[PDB]
Amino acid sequence: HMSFLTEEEQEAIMKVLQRDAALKRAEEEYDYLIKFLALGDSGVGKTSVLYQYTDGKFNSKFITTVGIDFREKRVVYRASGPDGATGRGQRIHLQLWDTAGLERFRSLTTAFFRDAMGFLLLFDLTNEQSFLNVRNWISQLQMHAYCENPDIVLCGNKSDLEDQRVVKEEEAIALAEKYGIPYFETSAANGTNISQAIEMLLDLIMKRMERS
Amino acid sequence: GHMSFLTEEEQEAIMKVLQRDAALKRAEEEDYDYLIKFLALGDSGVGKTSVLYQYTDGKFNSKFITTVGIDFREKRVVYRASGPDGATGRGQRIHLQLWDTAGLERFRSLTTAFFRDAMGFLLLFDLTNEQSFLNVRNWISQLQMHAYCENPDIVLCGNKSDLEDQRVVKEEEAIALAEKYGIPYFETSAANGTNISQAIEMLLDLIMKRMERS
Numbered sequence: 001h002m003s004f005l006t007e008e009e010q011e012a013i014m015k016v017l018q019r020d021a022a023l024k025r026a027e028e029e030y031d032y033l034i035k036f037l038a039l040g041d042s043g044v045g046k047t048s049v050l051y052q053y054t055d056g057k058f059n060s061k062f063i064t065t066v067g068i069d070f071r072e073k074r075v076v077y078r079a080s081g082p083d084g085a086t087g088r089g090q091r092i093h094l095q096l097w098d099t100a101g102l103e104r105f106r107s108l109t110t111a112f113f114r115d116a117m118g119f120l121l122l123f124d125l126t127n128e129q130s131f132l133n134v135r136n137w138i139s140q141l142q143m144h145a146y147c148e149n150p151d152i153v154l155c156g157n158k159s160d161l162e163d164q165r166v167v168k169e170e171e172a173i174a175l176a177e178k179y180g181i182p183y184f185e186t187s188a189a190n191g192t193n194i195s196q197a198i199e200m201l202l203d204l205i206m207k208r209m210e211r212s
Numbered sequence: 213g214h215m216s217f218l219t220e221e222e223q224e225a226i227m228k229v230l231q232r233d234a235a236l237k238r239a240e241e242e243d244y245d246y247l248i249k250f251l252a253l254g255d256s257g258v259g260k261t262s263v264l265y266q267y268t269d270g271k272f273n274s275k276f277i278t279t280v281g282i283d284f285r286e287k288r289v290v291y292r293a294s295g296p297d298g299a300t301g302r303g304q305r306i307h308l309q310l311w312d313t314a315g316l317e318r319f320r321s322l323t324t325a326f327f328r329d330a331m332g333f334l335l336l337f338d339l340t341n342e343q344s345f346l347n348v349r350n351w352i353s354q355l356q357m358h359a360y361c362e363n364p365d366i367v368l369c370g371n372k373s374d375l376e377d378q379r380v381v382k383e384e385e386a387i388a389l390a391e392k393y394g395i396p397y398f399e400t401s402a403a404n405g406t407n408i409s410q411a412i413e414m415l416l417d418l419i420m421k422r423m424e425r426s
């Protein structure tokens with residue numbers, strides 16, 4: 001009925017932080033460290049999406065994120081050229097930040113935005129209110145990011161729940177066009193579009209870094 | 213053991229600091245020659261807010277207003293390197309961001325988040341409070357683990373040296389602790405300002421000298 005920040009919950013968060021300082025200390029020395037961050041209302045599937053992508057697995061039981069967490073995955077990035085071209089493959093080491101969407105964690109999660117080079121914004125195709133909130137999330141991103149106009153990839157998630165969709169695809173494609181951000185309908189249950197969405201953000205983050 | 217979550221008012225406070233930090237950071241990523249960041253940490257009540265306030269504005273306030281999670285102050289200064297046999301180089305423009313962390317446990321993971329941003333640390337205990345000095349070992353251990361640098365520069369501050377009637381930390385003990393860890397030590401007063409600028413300038417030097425090597 002009345003819940004408080006338990007000691008176990010804070011122990012959890014401190015170990016995410018210890019692990020992070022560990023990861024960063026080592027990188028001061030595989031061949032590029034690309035970080036991005038997933039955000040969106042609680043229950044849209046941020047954790048599920050990252051898990052499907054790192055491990056190809058899905059757990060249908062809701063285990064809400066205690067503040068903050070992150071996964072990693074070593075991948076190969078090949079610079080995609082114009083009209084189907086690619087380029088050479090340098091090794092990319094991803095750090096995938098995963099934030100709690102609950103308000104009680106808003107200030108803890110908001111301080112990690114500056115660690116990100118790009119953002120995976122998620123709403124639930126079955127929850128119109130999570131879609132309405134995409135606007136508020138985008139301005140919080142502009143207001144706390146590194147970079148004046150940060151790279152974003154919008155995901156409407158739970159596309160496998162067709163008989164419960166309430167956000168019409170047109171409303172979502174139009175919102176995305178309004179802001180100039182790539183849009184993908186995803187499903188963490190079966191993996192649809194998960195790899196393409198993230199690979200699209202990686203491409204945005206690597207192409208932006210080759211204009212300096 | 214029942215740490216309240218942040219209230220709506222506590223959280224608006226912290227988001228404003230985050231809003232101010234991002235505006236400051238975005239302006240430096242594009243005037244002043246370097247942005248330099250310190251972070252003050254230590255138990256609640258040792259005088260972290262008061263120390264930074266004395267340093268930026270030469271003022272001191274007796275009423276205890278405990279820090280809501282996190283805050284920071286700024287100061288423009290001129291650092292001059294120290295060369296061989298006092299060969300003081302050109303005056304460099306330094307913009308200092310001075311992070312101020314709350315010391316209560318209920319804020320511990322929030323404030324630990326910000327050890328990433330620091331290039332150095334001001335570690336405070338209270339001279340009138342032996343328990344706050346005994347915890348200095350844990351704090352250093354924490355800093356070792358969460359600093360983003362290996363062997364982070366620390367300056368130890370034993371504060372409230374103006375309350376001489378109420379002093380309980382023996383001087384030899386703290387000099388021992390500081391020598392054991394190889395870190396500079398200053399007894400300070402946020403009230404009358406004794407040693408505040410010397411300790412903060414010592415930390416600036418460590419970081420600047422640390423920066424030149426690279």
Ligand SMILES: Nc1nc2c(ncn2[C@@H]2O[C@H](COP(=O)(O)OP(=O)(O)NP(=O)(O)O)[C@@H](O)[C@H]2O)c(=O)[nH]1
Nearest residue numbers: 042043044045046047048060065101158187188189
């Ligand atoms: N059918 C279906 N269920 C999904 C999908 N993605 C997530 N879920 C389910 O939705 C619930 C919430 O997912 P989860 O990743 O925990 O959500 P979250 O966005 O991380 N929430 P929080 O911010 O609280 O950590 C879980 O029951 C999960 O099984 C999806 O693509 N399809």
Ligand SMILES: Nc1nc2c(ncn2[C@@H]2O[C@H](COP(=O)(O)OP(=O)(O)NP(=O)(O)O)[C@@H](O)[C@H]2O)c(=O)[nH]1
Nearest residue numbers: 256257258259260261262274279315372401402403
């Ligand atoms: N005499 C004297 N009093 C001091 C000194 N430094 C702080 N105080 C007083 O002792 C209390 C400590 O206040 P403060 O600076 O807020 O401590 P803090 O470490 O930032 N506390 P918190 O972590 O809870 O935010 C206040 O009442 C302050 O006025 C000092 O050097 N001398």
Ligand SMILES: *CCC(=O)Nc1ccc(S(=O)(=O)N2CCCC2)c(OC)c1
Nearest residue numbers: 114115116117118146147148150151208
């Ligand atoms: C402009 C989009 C963006 O956020 N770019 C970006 C590039 C590089 C980094 S970093 O982590 O390698 N680094 C920290 C300070 C400068 C170099 C970041 O950090 C998030 C963002």
Ligand SMILES: *CCC(=O)Nc1ccc(S(=O)(=O)N2CCCC2)c(OC)c1
Nearest residue numbers: 328329330331332360361362364365422
């Ligand atoms: C090793 C001592 C130390 O902490 N040095 C240091 C120098 C510069 C920076 S930074 O703020 O310019 N930066 C953050 C991301 C990489 C570049 C930092 O980081 C706090 C530390």
Ligand SMILES: [Mg+2]
Nearest residue numbers: 046047064065
């Ligand atoms: Mg989650």
Ligand SMILES: [Mg+2]
Nearest residue numbers: 260261278279
């Ligand atoms: Mg304070």
